[PDB]
């Protein structure tokens, strides 16, 4: 579930 | 295959993606989302499920999540990404993913086709049978986002006949479809043994493991318990054993010694004695790996004057015989097994539509291309050709699309 926007 | 994509960062959204993973979670750096209308979406060379291996030279194969974030965030406007699709699939399915996929657009076009005077089945079929199964899941989500109604129920009201069966089948996930086909085979005053045997004998460990989990979510009961309720005798023992999906995994070493002993034990328990040691047959044929049992069946012919299939016809009868005959065919040549079942469903008067539909839906993304090779080689003409003669209308067209083409 670990979700980072780049 | 590793490939390279050049993204030009925009000040809004940067790359325009989300990522998951990292060596902290035993996962690579995978593209989680691709934001509509942003930098990565405009390249149209990136897909969800892609693993980012490098960014402007900086390796990311053993990078933590934060390490990958800092690397992607600190890169300049001109970004070169080394990307490889790490999502598993099958190269021998007939239905491939559509290359111009817009779930919202397909959802709207289907809604208009449902509400078009007389129902436009042609566009419903031409969309749904030309999308992958997970693309159909996205269309279903977008349909419920737009109309606030379930796509499956909306199509169930617009369609009828064998076309409704095909379309509603395509919408379910593979586990959901197998789970509901198994339930439909045991529900009612009887058991559709042929349908239960076809699914249980042909699915792999991984497929059965998901079926068992999904079957309990959908029906609040264990598949094994429903099997025990609808079957009896050795047939129950064989079905329960296979449905467990805990067959040994194909290892790297060939156990020649066990290959010979299994072949002897199959012979000793069957045509050498009077009667049959059915437990010995169930144990060997459900627990050994498939590559092992293929060699056992060739070694069996060294001891027996009849092959494994012929021996089954001499030893057992009824549903137990049918189960073993199906199981051995799936062990020996699974695509040929489905080619033969497809032939039987159409060769004679009328059509065994429930069988024809189930195979065309469930194997369309697994091994339909291998089924078609076996079919063409054995029967001389293509599966496509036999579907043409046996079905008509939009129903035929949908099956032809799931077939994928001629030969
Ligand atoms: Ca119509
Ligand atoms: Ca209907
Ligand atoms: Ca029943
Ligand atoms: Ca015997
Ligand atoms: Ca026919």
Burial degree of B156 (CB within 10 A; 0-12, 13-18, 19+): middle
Contact of B333 with B367, CB cutoff 8 Å: no
Between the alpha carbon of residue B358 and those of residues B203, B293, B341, B406, the distances in Å are 13, 27, 11, 20
Please report the DSSP string for B32-82 in residue order. Answer: EEE-TTSHHHHH----TTEEEEEETTEE-TT--HHHHHHHHHHS-SEEEEE
CB-CB neighbours of B405 under 10 Å: 12
A–B interface: beta-carbon pairs under 8 A: 28
Q: List the beta bridge partners of residue B277.
A: none
Contact of B24 with B18, CB cutoff 8 Å: no
- Residue entry with tokens 């899941």: B137
Q: How far apart are CA B101 and CA B124, in angstroms?
A: 15
Q: Do A2 and B69 touch (CB under 8 A)?
A: no
The number of helices, as runs of H, and strands, as runs of E, in chain B is 21, 6
Q: Do B69 and A3 touch (CB under 8 A)?
A: no
- Residue entry with tokens 């083409």: B405
Name the CA dihedral angle for B227, B231, B232, B235, rounded to a multiple of 10 degrees. -90
Contact of B215 with B223, CB cutoff 8 Å: yes
Burial degree of B377 (CB within 10 A; 0-12, 13-18, 19+): exposed
Residue B372's nearest CA partner among B324, B323, B405 is B405
Q: How far apart are CA B262 and CA B284, in angstroms?
A: 7
Please report the DSSP string for B374-407 in residue order. Answer: HHHHHHSS-HHHHHHHH--HHHHHHHHHHH-S--
Interface test with A, best of B19, B21, B63 (most A CBs within 10 A): B19
Contact of B392 with B83, CB cutoff 8 Å: no
How many whole angstroms from its chain centre is CA B227?
A: 22
- Residue entry with tokens 């291996």: B53
Residues 249-268 of B with CB under 8 A from A: none
Name the CA dihedral angle for B160, B166, B172, B177, rounded to a multiple of 10 degrees. 110
Q: How far apart are CA B180 and CA B195, in angstroms?
A: 11
What is the token pair recorded at B164? 């409704």
User: Which residues in chain A are contacts of B72 at CB distance < 8 A?
Assistant: 6
B335 — alpha (psi -120 to 50), left (phi > 0) or beta?
A: alpha
Query: Can you list the domains of chain B with their CATH numbers?
Result: 2-85 (2.30.42.10), 103-171 (1.10.220.10), 174-244 (1.10.220.10), 256-334 (1.10.220.10), 335-403 (1.10.220.10)
Q: List the beta bridge partners of residue B58.
A: B55
Residue B25 three-state SS: helix
User: Which residues in chain B are contacts of A5 at CB distance < 8 A?
Assistant: 13-14, 17-18, 33
Q: Do A4 and B65 touch (CB under 8 A)?
A: yes
Name the CA dihedral angle for B201, B202, B206, B210, rounded to a multiple of 10 degrees. -80
Residue partners of B233: CB distance under 8 A and separation at least 6: B320
User: What technique determined this structure?
Assistant: X-ray
User: Which residues in chain A are contacts of B25 at CB distance < 8 A?
Assistant: 2
B118 — alpha (psi -120 to 50), left (phi > 0) or beta?
A: left
Q: How far apart are CA B288 and CA B17, in angstroms?
A: 45
B15 Cβ under 8 Å from any chain A Cβ = yes
User: Which residues in chain A are contacts of B33 at CB distance < 8 A?
Assistant: 3, 5
Residue B171's nearest CA partner among B184, B183, B188, B154 is B154
**Cβ burial B228-263 (10 Å sphere, 16+ → b, else e):** eebbeebbbbbbbbbbbbebeeeeeeeeeeebbebb
B3 Cβ under 8 Å from any chain A Cβ = no
Give the distance from residue A1's alpha carbon to the nearest chain B alpha carbon, in angstroms. 7
């Amino acid at each position: 579930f670990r979700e980072t926007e780049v | 295959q590793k490939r390279g994509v050049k993204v030009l960062k925009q000040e809004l959204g940067g790359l325009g993606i989300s990522i998951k993973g990292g060596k902290e979670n035993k996962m690579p750096i995978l593209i989680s989302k691709i934001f509509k209308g942003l930098a990565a979406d405009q390249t149209q060379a990136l897909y969800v499920g892609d693993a980012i291996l490098s960014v402007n030279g900086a390796d990311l194969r053993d990078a933590t999540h934060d390490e990958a974030v800092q690397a992607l965030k600190r890169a300049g406007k001109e970004v070169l990404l080394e990307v490889k699709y790490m999502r598993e699939g099958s190269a021998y399915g007939s239905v491939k993913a559509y290359t111009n996929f817009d779930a919202e657009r397909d959802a709207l076009n289907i809604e208009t086709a449902i509400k078009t005077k007389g129902v436009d089945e042609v566009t419903i079929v031409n969309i749904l049978t030309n999308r992958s199964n997970e693309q159909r899941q996205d269309i279903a989500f977008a349909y419920q986002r737009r109309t606030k109604k379930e796509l499956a129920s909306a199509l169930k009201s617009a369609l009828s006949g064998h076309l409704e069966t095909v379309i509603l089948g395509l919408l379910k996930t593979p586990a959901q479809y197998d789970a509901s086909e198994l339930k439909a085979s045991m529900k009612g005053l009887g058991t559709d043994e042929d349908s239960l045997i076809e699914i249980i004998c042909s699915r792999t460990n991984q497929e059965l493991q998901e079926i068992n989990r999904v079957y309990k979510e959908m029906y609040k009961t264990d598949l094994e318990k429903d099997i025990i309720s609808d079957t009896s005798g050795d047939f129950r023992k064989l079905m329960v054993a296979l449905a467990k999906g805990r067959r040994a995994e194909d290892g790297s070493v060939i156990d020649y010694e066990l290959i010979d002993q299994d072949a002897r034990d199959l012979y000793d328990a069957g045509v050498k004695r009077k009667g049959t040691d059915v437990p010995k047959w169930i144990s060997i044929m459900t627990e050994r790996s498939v590559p092992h049992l293929q060699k056992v069946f060739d070694r069996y012919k060294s001891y027996s004057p009849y092959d494994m299939l012929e021996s089954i016809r001499k030893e057992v009868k009824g549903d137990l015989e049918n189960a073993f005959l199906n199981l051995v065919q799936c062990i020996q040549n699974k695509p040929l097994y489905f080619a033969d079942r497809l032939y039987d469903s159409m060769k004679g008067k009328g059509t065994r539509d429930k069988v024809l539909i189930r195979i065309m839906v469930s194997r369309s993304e697994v091994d339909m291309l291998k089924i078609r090779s076996e079919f063409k080689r054995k029967y001389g003409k293509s599966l496509y050709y036999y579907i043409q003669q046996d079905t008509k209308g939009d129903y035929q067209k949908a099956l032809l699309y799931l077939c994928g083409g001629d030969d």
